[PDB]
A paper describes a structure:
In mammals, there are three [name] family members (ZBP1, [name], and IMP3). Each protein contains six canonical RNA-binding domains, two RNA recognition motif (RRM) domains and four hnRNP K homology (KH) domains. These RNA-binding domains are arranged into three pairs (RRM12, KH12, and [name]). In vivo functional studies as well as in vitro work suggested that [name] domains are responsible for RNA recognition.
Similar to ZBP1KH34, we found that the individual KH3 and KH4 domains of [name] adopted the type 1 KH fold (βααββα) and were also arranged in an anti-parallel pseudo-dimer orientation. The overall structures of IMP2KH34 and ZBP1KH34 are almost identical (RMSD of 0.5 Å for all Cα atoms). We observed that IMP2KH34 had lower affinity to the ß-actin C28 zipcode RNA (Kd = 161 nM) compared with ZBP1KH34 (Kd = 15 nM). From the last round of selection, we identified a bipartite RNA element that included a 5′ CA element, CU-CA-C, followed by ten nucleotides and then a variable 3′ GG element, (A/U)-GG-(A/U). We found that the 5′ CA and the 3′ GG RNA element were bound specifically by the KH3 and KH4 protein domain, respectively. We hypothesized that the highly conserved GXXG motifs mediate phosphate backbone interactions and that the variable loops functioned to recognize specific nucleobases. To determine if the variable loops mediate differences in RNA-binding between ZBP1KH34 and IMP2KH34 we generated a chimeric protein where amino acids present near both variable loops of IMP2KH34 were exchanged with the corresponding amino acids present in the same position on ZBP1KH34 variable loops. We found that this exchange converted [name] into a ZBP1 like binding protein, which bound to the ß-actin zipcode, the ZBP1 RNA-binding element. We observed that only four amino acid mutations in the KH3 domain were necessary to allow [name] to bind to the ß-actin zipcode with nearly equal affinity to ZBP1KH34.
Residue numbers in the entry: 425 to 586
The structure:
């Protein structure tokens, strides 16, 4: 139950609703979830998505991400007859990324089949100063939470070993 950083991407048009008047909503979410929730600066004036940085343990991530998913649903940011679907980025050790993929890509293939979330480890990544790379997770709230949960397990199982 360590403190993780998750980048959750939301539609740019929803920033005002997520922040709220005088920032009352995003402050409320931060207290409710017990997590830090900040809106990262925009890469440009016409980007279609904005990045929310959520810092906190798994139980806090569930509440912070969940309340953001739920707020977007209230604001009607889903497709017709569909659930709110968001992309999130998590950081895993570069040395464990191959284990998330599995031999022949079979581990990531089963993972996507069980959760219904799309799980992508972008190619040709340069590990960051912590020697960590990105895993992309796209799906509805519960699918995203389950995918995140199992990826965290794989990461911890590899550490356990040696």
């Amino acid at each position: 139950s360590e403190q993780e950083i998750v980048n959750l991407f939301i539609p740019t048009q929803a920033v005002g609703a997520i922040i709220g008047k005088k920032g009352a909503h995003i402050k409320q979410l931060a207290r409710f979830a017990g997590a830090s929730i900040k809106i990262a600066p925009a890469e440009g004036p016409d980007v279609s998505e904005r990045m929310v940085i959520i810092t906190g343990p798994p139980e806090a991530q569930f509440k912070a991400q969940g309340r953001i998913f739920g707020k977007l649903k209230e604001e009607n940011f889903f497709n017709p007859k569909e659930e709110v679907k968001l992309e999130a980025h998590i950081r895993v050790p570069s040395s464990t990324a191959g284990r998330v993929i599995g031999k022949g890509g079979k581990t990531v293939n089963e993972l996507q089949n069980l959760t219904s979330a799309e799980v992508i480890v972008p190619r040709d990544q340069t590990p960051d100063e912590n020697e960590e790379v990105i895993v992309r997770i796209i799906g509805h709230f519960f699918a995203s939470q389950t995918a995140q949960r199992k990826i965290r397990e794989i990461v911890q199982q590899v550490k356990q070993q040696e």
